[PDB]
Design a protein around this motif. Structure first.
Motif, PDB file in Angstrom:
ATOM      1  N   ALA A  12       0.508  -1.211   0.138  1.00 37.79           N
ATOM      2  CA  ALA A  12       0.282   0.158  -0.655  1.00 37.79           C
ATOM      3  C   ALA A  12       0.489   1.074   0.223  1.00 37.79           C
ATOM      4  O   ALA A  12       2.132   0.986   0.376  1.00 37.79           O
ATOM      5  N   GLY A  13       0.593   2.426   0.234  1.00 38.86           N
ATOM      6  CA  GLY A  13       0.626   3.996  -0.248  1.00 38.86           C
ATOM      7  C   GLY A  13       1.452   3.599   1.114  1.00 38.86           C
ATOM      8  O   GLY A  13       0.721   3.749   1.874  1.00 38.86           O
ATOM      9  N   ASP A  14       2.977   4.557   1.411  1.00 37.58           N
ATOM     10  CA  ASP A  14       2.705   4.948   2.739  1.00 37.58           C
ATOM     11  C   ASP A  14       3.842   3.982   3.539  1.00 37.58           C
ATOM     12  O   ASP A  14       3.946   4.252   4.573  1.00 37.58           O
ATOM     13  N   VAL A  15       3.885   3.202   3.107  1.00 36.04           N
ATOM     14  CA  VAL A  15       4.039   1.462   4.145  1.00 36.04           C
ATOM     15  C   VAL A  15       6.112   1.669   3.664  1.00 36.04           C
ATOM     16  O   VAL A  15       6.572   1.095   5.396  1.00 36.04           O
ATOM     17  N   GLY A  16       6.388   3.137   2.960  1.00 33.65           N
ATOM     18  CA  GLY A  16       7.691   2.520   3.333  1.00 33.65           C
ATOM     19  C   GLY A  16       8.538   2.132   1.667  1.00 33.65           C
ATOM     20  O   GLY A  16       9.767   1.739   2.492  1.00 33.65           O
ATOM     21  N   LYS A  17       8.035   1.756   1.139  1.00 30.13           N
ATOM     22  CA  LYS A  17       8.123   0.941   0.033  1.00 30.13           C
ATOM     23  C   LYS A  17      10.311   1.352  -0.819  1.00 30.13           C
ATOM     24  O   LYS A  17      10.824   0.863  -1.086  1.00 30.13           O
ATOM     25  N   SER A  18      10.104   2.832  -1.238  1.00 33.47           N
ATOM     26  CA  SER A  18      10.909   3.325  -1.495  1.00 33.47           C
ATOM     27  C   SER A  18      11.562   4.217  -0.224  1.00 33.47           C
ATOM     28  O   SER A  18      13.128   4.055  -1.266  1.00 33.47           O
ATOM     29  N   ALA A  19      11.105   4.281   0.798  1.00 39.70           N
ATOM     30  CA  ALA A  19      12.500   4.395   1.982  1.00 39.70           C
ATOM     31  C   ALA A  19      12.759   2.609   1.810  1.00 39.70           C
ATOM     32  O   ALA A  19      14.458   2.787   2.109  1.00 39.70           O
ATOM     33  N   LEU A  20      13.010   1.945   1.937  1.00 40.84           N
ATOM     34  CA  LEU A  20      13.275   0.820   1.803  1.00 40.84           C
ATOM     35  C   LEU A  20      14.324   0.085   0.792  1.00 40.84           C
ATOM     36  O   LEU A  20      15.632  -0.006   1.226  1.00 40.84           O
ATOM     37  N   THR A  21      13.852   0.776   0.005  1.00 41.47           N
ATOM     38  CA  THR A  21      14.879   0.844  -1.161  1.00 41.47           C
ATOM     39  C   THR A  21      16.109   0.993  -1.605  1.00 41.47           C
ATOM     40  O   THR A  21      17.202   1.122  -1.939  1.00 41.47           O
ATOM     41  N   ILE A  22      15.792   3.278  -1.088  1.00 41.10           N
ATOM     42  CA  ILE A  22      16.530   3.518  -1.428  1.00 41.10           C
ATOM     43  C   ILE A  22      18.039   3.137  -0.038  1.00 41.10           C
ATOM     44  O   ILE A  22      18.874   3.722  -0.158  1.00 41.10           O
ATOM     45  N   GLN A  23      17.306   2.885   1.214  1.00 39.10           N
ATOM     46  CA  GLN A  23      18.411   2.701   2.127  1.00 39.10           C
ATOM     47  C   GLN A  23      19.524   1.822   1.270  1.00 39.10           C
ATOM     48  O   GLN A  23      19.928   2.130   1.029  1.00 39.10           O
ATOM     49  N   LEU A  24      18.946   0.563   0.940  1.00 37.42           N
ATOM     50  CA  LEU A  24      19.458  -0.450   0.005  1.00 37.42           C
ATOM     51  C   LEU A  24      20.227   0.077  -0.574  1.00 37.42           C
ATOM     52  O   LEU A  24      21.632  -0.303  -0.978  1.00 37.42           O
ATOM     53  N   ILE A  25      20.404   0.497  -1.914  1.00 34.37           N
ATOM     54  CA  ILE A  25      21.126   1.310  -2.879  1.00 34.37           C
ATOM     55  C   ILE A  25      21.732   2.394  -2.546  1.00 34.37           C
ATOM     56  O   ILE A  25      22.699   2.360  -3.225  1.00 34.37           O
ATOM     57  N   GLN A  26      20.929   3.371  -1.584  1.00 35.23           N
ATOM     58  CA  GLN A  26      22.099   4.901  -1.575  1.00 35.23           C
ATOM     59  C   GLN A  26      22.794   4.789   0.281  1.00 35.23           C
ATOM     60  O   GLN A  26      23.353   5.454   0.026  1.00 35.23           O
ATOM     61  N   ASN A  27      22.018   4.143   0.847  1.00 35.48           N
ATOM     62  CA  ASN A  27      22.336   4.037   1.837  1.00 35.48           C
ATOM     63  C   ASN A  27      22.336   5.493   3.012  1.00 35.48           C
ATOM     64  O   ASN A  27      22.823   6.469   3.367  1.00 35.48           O
ATOM     65  N   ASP A 109       3.300 -21.490  -5.847  1.00 38.05           N
ATOM     66  CA  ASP A 109       4.839 -21.010  -5.185  1.00 38.05           C
ATOM     67  C   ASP A 109       6.108 -19.911  -5.522  1.00 38.05           C
ATOM     68  O   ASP A 109       5.664 -20.194  -6.645  1.00 38.05           O
ATOM     69  N   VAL A 110       5.461 -18.879  -5.091  1.00 39.13           N
ATOM     70  CA  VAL A 110       6.082 -18.122  -5.874  1.00 39.13           C
ATOM     71  C   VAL A 110       6.697 -17.455  -4.208  1.00 39.13           C
ATOM     72  O   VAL A 110       6.535 -16.582  -3.055  1.00 39.13           O
ATOM     73  N   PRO A 111       8.187 -16.721  -5.189  1.00 42.52           N
ATOM     74  CA  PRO A 111       9.184 -16.204  -3.514  1.00 42.52           C
ATOM     75  C   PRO A 111       8.403 -15.209  -3.200  1.00 42.52           C
ATOM     76  O   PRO A 111       8.753 -13.693  -4.049  1.00 42.52           O
ATOM     77  N   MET A 112       8.548 -15.014  -1.946  1.00 39.33           N
ATOM     78  CA  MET A 112       7.982 -13.919  -1.089  1.00 39.33           C
ATOM     79  C   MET A 112       8.700 -13.385   0.173  1.00 39.33           C
ATOM     80  O   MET A 112       8.621 -15.034   0.644  1.00 39.33           O
ATOM     81  N   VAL A 113       8.950 -12.265   1.031  1.00 38.79           N
ATOM     82  CA  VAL A 113       9.421 -11.508   2.031  1.00 38.79           C
ATOM     83  C   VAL A 113       8.171 -11.303   2.136  1.00 38.79           C
ATOM     84  O   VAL A 113       7.726  -9.545   1.709  1.00 38.79           O
ATOM     85  N   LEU A 114       7.506 -11.030   3.608  1.00 43.77           N
ATOM     86  CA  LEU A 114       6.790 -10.107   4.064  1.00 43.77           C
ATOM     87  C   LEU A 114       7.326  -9.306   4.733  1.00 43.77           C
ATOM     88  O   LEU A 114       8.236 -10.141   6.093  1.00 43.77           O
ATOM     89  N   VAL A 115       7.083  -8.054   4.783  1.00 40.77           N
ATOM     90  CA  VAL A 115       7.833  -6.885   5.690  1.00 40.77           C
ATOM     91  C   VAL A 115       7.040  -6.580   6.157  1.00 40.77           C
ATOM     92  O   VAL A 115       5.935  -6.070   6.279  1.00 40.77           O
ATOM     93  N   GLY A 116       7.116  -6.474   7.936  1.00 45.57           N
ATOM     94  CA  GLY A 116       6.312  -5.085   8.509  1.00 45.57           C
ATOM     95  C   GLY A 116       7.284  -3.685   8.616  1.00 45.57           C
ATOM     96  O   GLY A 116       8.253  -4.367   9.630  1.00 45.57           O
ATOM     97  N   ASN A 117       7.150  -2.777   7.952  1.00 44.17           N
ATOM     98  CA  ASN A 117       7.944  -1.764   7.910  1.00 44.17           C
ATOM     99  C   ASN A 117       7.762  -0.652   9.302  1.00 44.17           C
ATOM    100  O   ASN A 117       6.654  -0.660   9.872  1.00 44.17           O
ATOM    101  N   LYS A 118       8.530   0.266   9.773  1.00 42.65           N
ATOM    102  CA  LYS A 118       7.878   1.054  10.649  1.00 42.65           C
ATOM    103  C   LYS A 118       8.166   0.900  11.725  1.00 42.65           C
ATOM    104  O   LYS A 118       7.502   1.371  12.256  1.00 42.65           O
ATOM    105  N   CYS A 119       9.041  -0.224  12.158  1.00 40.43           N
ATOM    106  CA  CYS A 119       9.088  -1.085  13.569  1.00 40.43           C
ATOM    107  C   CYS A 119       9.628   0.221  14.213  1.00 40.43           C
ATOM    108  O   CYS A 119       9.188  -0.193  15.669  1.00 40.43           O
TER     109      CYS A 119
END
Ligand SMILES: Nc1nc2c(ncn2[C@@H]2O[C@H](COP(=O)(O)OP(=O)(O)O)[C@@H](O)[C@H]2O)c(=O)[nH]1
Ligand SMILES: [Mg+2]
Length: 169
Positions: A12-27, A109-119
């Motif tokens: 969903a919007g605002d869950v942190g998809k972009s923030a998660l990605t940018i941490q991994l890519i750009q620290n 059978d689809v590879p997935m990980v459930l991520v609970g963000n903003k902990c």
């Protein structure tokens, strides 16, 4: 040698998809990244003794044509299904993402990980147990993250690569 993997970050919007990605890519933690921008990033990493090239799609929801959503689901090899721990609706939306991705790929059978963000936030409305239980019901890992503090971020992406490998193998 180097193998490329297509990873897709959904939720969903605002869950942190972009923030998660940018941490991994750009620290770094980005506070403001336009919620309507969908882009992909490449990153080289070594996991369990094997270099791979991650091609990560940071999704943003509806496409011009739904056929385009279906295509990135078909080509996507693994999915980070992200909700925010302060947003019950975003958690309930996971039922839809799980269904839709299976449906498009016509696969059980689809590879997935459930991520609970903003902990890092105290205003939590989705219990650890309910998310763990949902992930277990799908046979997938559950990882709690904070894009802000970087808790769990690397583990979430690396675990997804491991799930993709298990599926391919
Ligand atoms: N406190 C906290 N804020 C977060 C976290 N992840 C994302 N945010 C913020 O939540 C908002 C939405 O993040 P964004 O990455 O744009 O969400 P997206 O719509 O899923 O791409 C932004 O202001 C982020 O700074 C997190 O783990 N903790
Ligand atoms: Mg975004």
């Amino acid at each position: 040698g180097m193998t490329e993997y297509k990873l897709v970050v959904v939720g969903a919007g605002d869950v942190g998809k972009s923030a998660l990605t940018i941490q991994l890519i750009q620290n770094h933690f980005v506070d403001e990244y336009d919620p309507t921008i969908e882009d992909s990033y490449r990153k080289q990493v070594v996991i369990d003794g094997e270099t791979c090239l991650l091609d990560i799609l940071d999704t943003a929801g509806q496409e011009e044509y739904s056929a385009m959503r279906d295509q990135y689901m078909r080509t996507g090899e693994g999915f980070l299904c992200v909700f925010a721990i302060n947003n019950t609706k975003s958690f309930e939306d996971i039922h839809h993402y799980r269904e839709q991705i299976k449906r498009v790929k016509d696969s059980e059978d689809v590879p997935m990980v459930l991520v609970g963000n903003k902990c890092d936030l105290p205003s939590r409305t989705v219990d650890t147990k309910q998310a763990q239980d949902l992930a277990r019901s799908y046979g997938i890992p559950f990882i709690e993250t904070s894009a802000k503090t970087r808790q769990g971020v690397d583990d979430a992406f690396y675990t997804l690569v491991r799930e993709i490998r298990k599926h391919k193998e």
